[PDB]
């Protein structure tokens, strides 16, 4: 990706302004629940202003930084895709479950992940990638050994390095692994995305067996799903107490969110920060709460 200068950033801001104006169309009636594009693009704008202010008089330093070059290219691309969604979608955008509205929700989730990453790498607007603290010690040691203090690596280099410790099946498993870890959908793995993935699928010692058991062969796992989409999806099981699904929390990145149908026909969502996901699912099954993953009668045996 090319060098970033102030003129590229301001062009991106103009495109972002066009998106937030399109999204305020009263016929659209977007709900305010996270991930909310009308929160996320303004917050992204404000954080980018903070970054540019920290680099006043040294914009060349910022604009040559590899992570920032990739980030700005991706933000521009994804903002243009959102505009194209409105121009191709026209009145279909006003229908809640239309293809363009589902695409807008997926993009909203991607913008949320991008913002979180940007703040993890530039917490007060200054680049802090070289001292980024990976949460799990065994995962931190992997990154230090393979990549030093690097903040971002291409997917193919990341795959090759990870395969040395946790072998990866070629084909669709490798594709599914990439889709899980590449939260910002940019074909790179940042140290932030690595931190999130290794928190979600801890312990490191069995990382990809955990991921396979919780995300590939578990029908309860939902990729790129929001809180409101979980409520919608479980509505058809409101008559089947114990139906449940789980996904990444979008506002507490690195935490899981489990949605379930209660005995009195409510849909609740909970974040099991007290214990690992494996254990939350095991305990919830034994206690009668997490019985029917995505409404199915058979539940995986995580023992």
């Amino acid at each position: 990706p090319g060098t970033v200068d102030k003129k590229m950033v301001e062009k991106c801001w103009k495109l972002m302004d066009k998106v937030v104006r399109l999204c305020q169309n009263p016929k659209l009636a977007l709900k305010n629940s996270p991930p909310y594009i009308l929160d996320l693009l303004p917050d992204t704008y404000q954080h980018l202003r903070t970054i540019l202010s920290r680099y006043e008089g040294k914009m060349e330093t910022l604009g040559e930084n590899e992570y920032f070059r990739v980030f700005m290219e991706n933000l521009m691309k994804k903002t243009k895709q959102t505009i194209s969604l409105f121009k191709e979608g026209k009145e279909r955008m006003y229908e809640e479950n239309s293809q363009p509205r589902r695409n807008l929700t997926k993009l909203s989730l991607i913008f949320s992940h991008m913002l979180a990453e940007l703040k993890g790498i530039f917490p007060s607007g200054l680049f802090q990638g070289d001292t980024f603290r990976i949460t799990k010690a065994d995962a931190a040691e992997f990154w230090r050994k393979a990549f030093g203090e690097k903040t971002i690596v291409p997917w193919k280099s990341f795959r090759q390095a990870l395969h040395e410790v946790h072998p990866i099946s070629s084909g669709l498993e490798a594709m599914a692994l990439k889709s899980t870890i590449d939260l910002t959908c940019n074909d790179y793995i940042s140290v932030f995305e690595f931190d999130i993935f290794t928190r979600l699928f801890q312990p490191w010692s069995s990382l990809l067996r955990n991921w396979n058991s919780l995300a590939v062969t578990h029908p309860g796992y939902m990729a790129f799903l929001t809180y409101d989409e979980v409520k919608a999806r479980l509505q058809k099981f409101i008559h089947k107490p114990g139906s449940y699904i789980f996904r990444l929390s979008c506002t507490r990145l690195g935490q899981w969110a489990i949605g379930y149908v209660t005995a009195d026909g409510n849909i609740l969502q909970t974040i099991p920060h007290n214990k690992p996901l494996f254990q939350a699912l095991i305990d919830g099954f034994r206690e009668g709460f997490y019985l029917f993953p995505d409404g199915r009668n058979q539940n995986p045996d995580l023992t």
Partner: peptide, 24 residues
């Protein structure tokens, strides 16, 4: 009623929050 469209630089994120409840 007016529907005032706010610009990118005028929106202070509402930061509205989804309801997460204690484990069952």
């Amino acid at each position: 009623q007016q529907v005032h469209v706010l610009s990118l630089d005028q929106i202070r994120a509402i930061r509205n929050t989804n309801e997460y409840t204690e484990g069952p």
